[PDB]
Amino acid sequence: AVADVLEFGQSEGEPIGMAPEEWRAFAARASLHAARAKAKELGADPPWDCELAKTPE
Amino acid sequence: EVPRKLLEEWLAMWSGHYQLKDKLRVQLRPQRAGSEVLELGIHGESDDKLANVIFQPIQDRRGRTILLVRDQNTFGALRQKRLMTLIHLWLVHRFKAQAVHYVTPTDDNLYQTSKMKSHGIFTEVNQEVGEIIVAEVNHPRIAELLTPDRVALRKLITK
Amino acid sequence: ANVIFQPIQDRRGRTILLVRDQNTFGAELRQKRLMTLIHLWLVHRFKAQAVHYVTP
């Protein structure tokens, strides 16, 4: 979700806070808390909700 | 999923209709370094600023997005051709705005908001306490204009 | 005295008070920091980061 926002910023010619590959490397080893905090620093705060997608159980 | 290029495409339709050759480019950046106030600029091939909107997107208590407009101008004597309406259509779509507030009730702002009401961008326009113009977005009309077939939009651009 | 204002949030989630109007109506009450006390309370009440005045 954050990658999509960063790619859009790049396509729009806005200045890169971090490269796509750099974000992916960070996200891969980040808690949700840490990923959200970092995204917020980069001005990327996409709507994302894992609660909505939970099964009936 | 609302790129600057979308407004550039609309302005190409516009330039085409009015037989103006100058390729109009769209710029959206902080009005100055590190600011939450933004400037939408329309630039020609010479990079001259032909129109602008200076504004800050904010949220009210109910979480509704409002664009606080500090200033808007059609600089190039481009006037009387609905350019500012196109810019507002794009801004309202880009920021999913519920309303636009104008900080100073200048003659131009009253004129422009009245014009955009007639184009259907706004349902209501009212000067409120503090002498600010509050313009409520006509969501059905915005949706109509953004239809991919561009029929309603072309009609707006070409009169 | 009065303050007419709307509390709003910027992109960063910071609270700003948008002040449309402020007045110290009573002449006896002026030059005594009344409006300062009101603003102290408003800033505390709404946990404001900034105050914007619409008309200079």
Chain A nearest CA to B88, separation (Å): 19
Residues preceding gaps in chain A (C to N > 2.5 Å) = none
> How long is chain C?
56
Task: Please indicate whether, in this complex, the C-beta atoms of B132 and C10 are within 8 angstroms of each other.
Answer: no
- What span, in angstroms and rounded, lies between the C-alpha atoms of C43 and C37? 10
Q: Give the C-alpha separation, B25 to B139, whole Å.
A: 26
**Chains in contact with A, where contact requires at least 3 CB pairs less than 8 Å apart:** B
β-partners of residue B135 are B100, B125
Ramachandran quadrant class, C16 (left: phi over 0; alpha: psi -120 to 50; beta: rest): beta
Strand partners of residue C15: C9
- How close, in Å, is residue B4 to chain A by CA atoms? 7
Q: Could you tell me if C3 and C22 are in contact, meaning their C-beta atoms sit under 8 angstroms apart?
A: yes
Phi, psi of B50 (to 5 degrees): -95, -25
Q: How far apart are the C-alpha atoms of B120 and B102, rounded to whole Å? A: 18
3 state SS for chain B = CCCHHHHHHHHHHHHHHCCCCCCCEEEEEECCCCCCCEEEEEECCCCCEEEEEEEEEEECCCCCEEEEEEEEEECCCCCCCCHHHHHHHHHHHHHCCCEEEECCCCHHHHHHHHHHHHHCCEEEEEEECCCEEEEEECHHHHHHHCCCCCHHHHHHHHC
Contact assignment for A11 to B3 by CB distance below 8 Å: yes
Which residues of C are less than 8 Å from B130 in CB distance? 4, 20-21, 54-55
Maximum distance among all Cα pairs of chain B, rounded to whole angstroms? 46
- DSSP 8-state symbol, C54: S
DSSP state letter for A18:
S
Short-list B78, B97, B92, B85, CA closest to B155: B85
Q: 3-state class of C7 per DSSP?
A: strand
Do residues B117 and B132 lie in contact, with contact meaning Cβ atoms separated by under 8 Å?
no
**Type of residue at B118:** S
Approach to solving: X-ray
Integer Cα distance of A6 and A34 in angstroms = 17
Give helix A2-11 / helix A20-28 axis angle, nearest 10°.
Answer: 170
Identify the helix (H) or strand (E) that includes residue C21. strand C15-23
Taking the C-alpha atoms of residue C43 and residue C26, their distance in angstroms, rounded to an integer, is 23
The residue count of chain A comes to: 57
**Amino acid type, B54:** I
H-helix or E-strand containing A21? Answer: helix A20-28
Strands B99-102, B122-128: pairing is unpaired
Q: Which helix (H) or strand (E) holds A35?
A: helix A32-41
Please indicate if any CB of chain B lies within 8 Å of the CB of A12: yes
Nearest Cα neighbor of B12 from B153, B140, B142 is B153
Are the beta carbons of B58 and C4 separated by less than 8 Å?
no
B3 touches chain A (CB under 8 A): yes
- For residue A8, which residues of chain B lie inside 8 Å, CB to CB? 1, 3
Q: Which position has the token pair 């009253």?
A: B110
> And the tokens for C7?
């509390």
Are B36 and C12 inside 8 Å of each other by CB? yes
Tell me which DSSP letter residue C12 carries: T
For C9, which of B59, B103, B132 is closest by C-beta distance? B59
Count of beta carbons in the 10 Å neighbourhood of residue B58: 22
Q: Could you tell me which of C3, A9, A4 has the C-alpha nearest to residue B28?
A: A9
